[PDB]
Design an enzyme around this catalytic site. Structure first.
Site, short mmCIF file in Angstrom:
data_model
loop_
_atom_site.label_atom_id
_atom_site.label_comp_id
_atom_site.label_asym_id
_atom_site.label_seq_id
_atom_site.Cartn_x
_atom_site.Cartn_y
_atom_site.Cartn_z
N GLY K 63 0.82 -1.19 0.00
CA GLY K 63 0.00 0.00 0.00
C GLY K 63 0.86 1.25 0.00
O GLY K 63 1.95 1.24 -0.57
N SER K 92 5.29 -5.80 -1.26
CA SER K 92 5.70 -4.40 -1.31
C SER K 92 6.04 -3.81 0.08
O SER K 92 6.85 -4.39 0.83
CB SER K 92 4.62 -3.61 -2.05
OG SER K 92 4.27 -4.33 -3.23
N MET K 93 5.42 -2.69 0.44
CA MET K 93 5.64 -2.10 1.75
C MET K 93 5.58 -3.12 2.89
O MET K 93 6.21 -2.91 3.91
CB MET K 93 4.63 -0.98 2.00
CG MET K 93 4.86 0.27 1.18
SD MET K 93 6.72 0.85 1.09
CE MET K 93 7.09 1.01 2.97
N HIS K 117 9.12 -6.56 -5.04
CA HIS K 117 8.73 -5.60 -6.05
C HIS K 117 8.02 -4.43 -5.37
O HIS K 117 7.20 -4.64 -4.46
CB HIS K 117 7.83 -6.24 -7.11
CG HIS K 117 7.29 -5.27 -8.10
ND1 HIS K 117 8.00 -4.88 -9.22
CD2 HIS K 117 6.11 -4.60 -8.15
CE1 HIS K 117 7.28 -4.01 -9.91
NE2 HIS K 117 6.14 -3.81 -9.27
N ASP K 155 8.25 -9.92 -10.80
CA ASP K 155 7.11 -10.32 -9.96
C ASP K 155 7.40 -11.72 -9.41
O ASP K 155 6.69 -12.68 -9.69
CB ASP K 155 5.80 -10.27 -10.75
CG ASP K 155 5.45 -8.85 -11.22
OD1 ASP K 155 4.49 -8.72 -12.00
OD2 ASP K 155 6.07 -7.81 -10.87
#
Ligand code: CA
Ligand code: CA
Ligand code: CA
Ligand code: CA
Ligand code: CA
Ligand code: CA
Ligand code: CA
Ligand code: CA
Ligand code: CA
Ligand code: CA
Ligand code: CA
Ligand code: CA
Ligand code: CA
Lengths: 173, 177, 174, 178, 176, 176, 178, 178, 174, 173, 177
Positions: K63, K92-93, K117, K155
């Site tokens: 996010g 991610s985050m 990623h 990915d």
């Protein structure tokens, strides 16, 4: 547009032979299409009859009464033919056809209840009932009394009441 | 949109075939787009032949003052007399429009109804415009403006008979039967 | 996106109308029903002596509109053959059944359903009216039809011929 | 965005599909349902009325759909004495296969990268009845046993063009001429 | 319809180009636009299969099934189908464009190319193998390397695309 | 709920006022808010029917049926219900406010009042007659004149309203 | 979302009700009936609790409903307790009528707050009378001719804290204590 | 916006309706349907369990609604030996009348300006069966003939409080004591 | 807006649960069904020897969720009386029927409908399962139930007692 | 909240007795509620069993496998009880309960088909099938072969397959 | 929202009862609102007792970068060591957050998946931030930044085993059975 030759409707073919379909709920748009068709047919020849097929649940009183005044106003007699159903303003319209040329299909049904400032609505319902009485030779008091009920009338019942002149044949027998 | 064919093979819609006979159908709410169509129709007929009359059938609940007044001013500018025939109803701008028809030639169907109440940017603009609409109404009918102002301040539906009395039409049209 | 034949520019349904063919598809409701009627009235005026071929493919729907088709079929002198393809249920069978005797066909894989779904007293008068028409069209008794219809029961073409709602099942010519 | 084609005669104007309809080509495209089907059947009836001896080319590219609308197409194809060729492009799934495989025998084609799935997705006891019917048509169309088709249809695999020739649902794969 | 001309519905700019055998394939690839394109291709071929066709391609990509129907139809017809990439070609876009008659595949100089194909999983893998196979057949590069480069989200300049083998000539800037 | 206090759901500002017999009738008159108001009125009366109730009224109007249930409940209970108009009272608003214990109906000085009641037509006329009858009973003016003035869409200042008879005193501006 | 606080006697109060104990009401956002009936509810409560202690009404609104704004003003003026006003952020339209109707000497404004006395606004003669009233009230509250308020209120211009002092709508600008 | 009532004991907190439920008052309000009905029936069962000899006060104000949900209320009222009084306020229409009229005899009230409509709006042959049932209950409840109720119910008129006393559906109109 | 009794703050349904009453209302679907179950499991743990009173007022709905109620009723030792009020249709009768023998009541004006609407083979196995349960609960034959259920047929309480889906119709005590 | 004493759910009463309802589609939110309930019950007493009632159509693989790793990771044995149905991840979850303490209601049904970049989805389906094999003592190849079908299993079939240990009694007979 | 009662009668929800044992549930998409809840929880536990550890369970798709980094900076500012337990997934985050957990104390459940990623106002801002996230990732894992940059440009879903290899966690958690 439906069965189309060239924009040129099935309905527009029937109009060459002076027939007008009145169909779906009566609101301003379809009413003005019917009215334009009437002034056109009158103007072509005010001495040939017009045949106004009616199949409507009813709707706008103003638009329905505009069709009716248009009908009365054009010299040409407007025959009417109820098919499927006439209710609310559909009965005002259909019954206002030329006396002796108002027809109805055998399985169609008819409904003279007129559902509607309130002082004005009541006046309009009286004018509407007045008109059904003139159209059927019946008393206003009878029509008022019969209309407040939500009963559907057969073609036989509609004939005995006076809103029409003959029920169409079943030419298959 | 029913369609009428003429032979010599070309194809009008029904409103367009009436327009060949100089009839115009002012119908539905008065807004800019339908008002332009009517104004173009008016300008077109007058140029085609300014001697023959135009027959404007009016069945409308009213709508924008701006757009209605553009219709009135067009009816008043062009040379050809514009008859008006009120069918169904004429409310608000409807009555400003129909009553501004060439005097002697304002008709109404027996069962049509009329309503001169004018429902309504800054408040002093709304006032000026409302006096202007009443001022036209009063000129049209032959009545004083005080009279018009008090009777337009009610939700009075008028019969054709009352509309003839009051002066907004010249003639109730007949029932033939 | 409805194709066109020049002959001047018919759409495929108007072209078939030159040959006195009318198509009856989708749910039966006022608008499509009023279209079929306009075609029947138009075709009858053209020639009352020549037969009309009515293809029928519908789930059923409104009694009022469907009974307007039946009456129009019955009112005009020109015989109305009916061809059932795909399916005919509820009002669709009242219409297809009411074709001229001997001239009621059905394609091999089509299906029939005489059940009629639906002011309470009024609903009951309408259902008696439809079951009465179906009995007259099938040479069957009102009691038989009334019992067979309160099932939700699909009928092959064979079954529908036995019942007598049609006269001929059309060929598989391949 | 349907392009038109002007031909000059005595000047006429066809959308591309109607232009193809002059050469007896029909386009069965998108989901099968009562409207597009009606249109197809009308085209089938027209072409046949014109000339029962010239063939009809039904190109097919559908995910399938309504069983009753599909069976009406199939039954029109069979009723008209004119031979209807089928050409599967892109995909034929479910009702698209019952349709395509009912093309005149020897005249059912398929493009090389197209795909075919004969699974027939489905009130209870009726659904069983139509599924048997659909599998019966698929069997007769491919010369297979219905037992076999019942097994393979329920397993929800796609078939390549080659596999569909091996199965009996088509007669020829059209070439890569370029 | 736009901009149009009626006759002595209407005759729009794409119909006028189609008279010169020019087909415009634009927006996402889906069944309706692909069926229009296939009908155009079969039409033109029927009229003259010895005359080239010019297929302009500007598309984000879309339906594999529909894109492959366009490709197989290009390949079935004997008429050569030149392809010209303008703006972008991505996914089925590249599969379609790179299948143009060899020698006759072009791209505008600021156009961009992306061979990544975003996608029951056994079947998604299977169609992806088909696309990557076709990409390799069209380019002269190995499946292994096509597979390696498609697994990344890099856009390609017209120069990278010509060097890769998907096109044959970059069209000129002729105001120079 | 707003602004709230939980206990030694929550105890909001209207519940706190209700402890001092103050009921707030606001927004349009509909069945849910009217049932809350009627339950409050029956509660307070049950606790002490010799102690006044203070009903604050600020409403465009609404459901005749619900408004009349509030009115009949005010009249059933022996406790006097003072009413105070603030902001506006229109339609059922006026019917409700003007039914306050006589001597104990108030209005704020810049509040406004409108007795017009917008509305099967025989029944719409019948309920309208009931409202106009009640308005006349509450004001000391004749039905004929109540009927005349309601048929117009004029707002009334607190002064016009006191002179008419719907209220008994205008509340003061006490910063003078 | 809005947090909670405890006080002694062992009781939860939302931050606003805790401030209510100090006779502070918060009036924020567009003037409409819900928030205005809530501000009035609060003002009645404070008046019932103690009719002589001052009330402090914070004001941050772009204006809105005339009926509901005048309801607040009238409730403010009816209760004998002096209602002080503190404009923060902005007061526009009914906000200025509300804020300027505070007890003379006890109307305040934060240094970067902005004032705007233009009044925007169902029948038209009534709308004109209503605007007179609002300017009549603004004139009284500032000690200026109605004539001048009419002209100045047409403009749709924004006054600073200092310009609001010069006009007479407030009595004191509050300090930056940094 | 449901106000609460604090009582101090040993401090408890009731919403107003639950406070009234301590005095055996139930509020039947809005359209009749499965949820609000369930709630009413639960209240009926509770109160009765507490004390079968003390009465229950069902205030009624509904447009009517579901026949099966209404008949479940009616049947609970009759099953519990506790006498359920009914008080019509505002309106009782359709299922609201079958409910209200089934209150203990002699203990069915109605506010003076309230209104009453016994029309019962309606698969075919079943609808006839329930309508007879509803009219039969209405008849037994008012001491009238079912023939009579069948005639009047279908005519869609409203009845005043007075007329509803004359008919037999209530026993008393409550007064205007103010 | 669900009322409250202090005893400390029960809601009207929690208060009735102290007396081992559970209410079953509206359509049967996962969430409400999982609630009724949680109450049954909770009540059984409290005392397995004391009866549970289950009021039942539902149009029916999901077979999975409704069959989870039946099984939970059957799994726990504590007898589960069922009181039908208003109506019980489709899954609602499978549930109400499966009350402990002798302890299945119905209010005078309630109605019963044993019809069960609904992968084709799987649907047919599920309907045989439900009709088998209804036969066992009524002392009737599987053929009788199968025939009576393919009608859409509402049953008075009298009729439902004759069938043997309940044991007692409760009183009209007024 | 449903049967409420005071916020205090029916479900929260069952939790005092170490029961957890797993209900509706498995997505992140309900999964984290179940997971929090497990870490809580483990922390109270890692030696008493936990009873995980399962009734789900399935859903998110990530969230379902998080519940499963949580289950395996807490020392306390998690009994599972299928009621109504377990499908997709519902079978992975339910079958991963403590060997010898996996139960099922008699009329409930079970469905091991796992519907799902594609290379990754296939890997995940293999991990999922691997796990169903470990849980049933069956061969991976059998599970893969049985799962690609969209067939529902009876409680009897689920017992013979090995996903559970006993079918609950009908204690009414 | 199941509820836990303690007796002496007060009533927590389940997440709140875990928070009494110093557990925090970072779940769902990373946005400002849930990030604030987590940050308040972190500040609250540290002040209550900075010696005991905090256990942050992370199950997130990623996010907002902004909100994630506020969480990281809070974990790094407060004194109490923050263990992180990745369950379900961390994308991610998510991975920036979990990997910034106190070294030695970063756990992952056997079947969880990982994805570094970082998907992504002006383009040169997006670059700076993306290098910053990779720069933290690289510090966290013990890898070079070039390495991280090429592996974050695919990915790639990572298993727990791969995540331990690469350096983002210290320990795969066990299966007891
Ligand atoms: Ca005439
Ligand atoms: Ca005549
Ligand atoms: Ca003129
Ligand atoms: Ca005939
Ligand atoms: Ca080629
Ligand atoms: Ca090659
Ligand atoms: Ca009183
Ligand atoms: Ca009086
Ligand atoms: Ca004051
Ligand atoms: Ca039991
Ligand atoms: Ca464990
Ligand atoms: Ca163990
Ligand atoms: Ca730390």
């Amino acid at each position: 547009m439906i069965p189309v030759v060239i924009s040129y409707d099935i309905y527009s073919r029937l109009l060459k032979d002076r027939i007008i379909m009145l169909t779906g709920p009566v609101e301003d748009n379809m009413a003005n299409s019917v009215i334009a068709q009437l002034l056109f047919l009158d103007a072509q020849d005010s001495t040939k009859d017009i045949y106004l097929y009616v199949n409507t649940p009813g709707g706008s009183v103003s638009a329905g009464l505009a069709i009716v005044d248009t009908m009365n106003f054009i010299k040409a007699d407007v025959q009417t033919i109820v098919m499927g159903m006439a209710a609310s303003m559909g009965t005002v319209i259909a019954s206002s056809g030329a006396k002796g040329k108002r027809f109805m299909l055998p399985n169609a049904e008819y409904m003279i209840h007129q559902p509607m400032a309130p002082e004005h609505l009541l006046k309009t319902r009286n004018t509407l009932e007045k008109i059904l009485a003139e159209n059927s030779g019946q008393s206003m008091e009878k029509v008022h009394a019969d209309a407040e009920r939500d009963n559907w009338m057969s073609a036989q019942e509609t004939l005995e009441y006076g809103f029409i002149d003959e029920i169409m044949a079943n030419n298959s027998l």
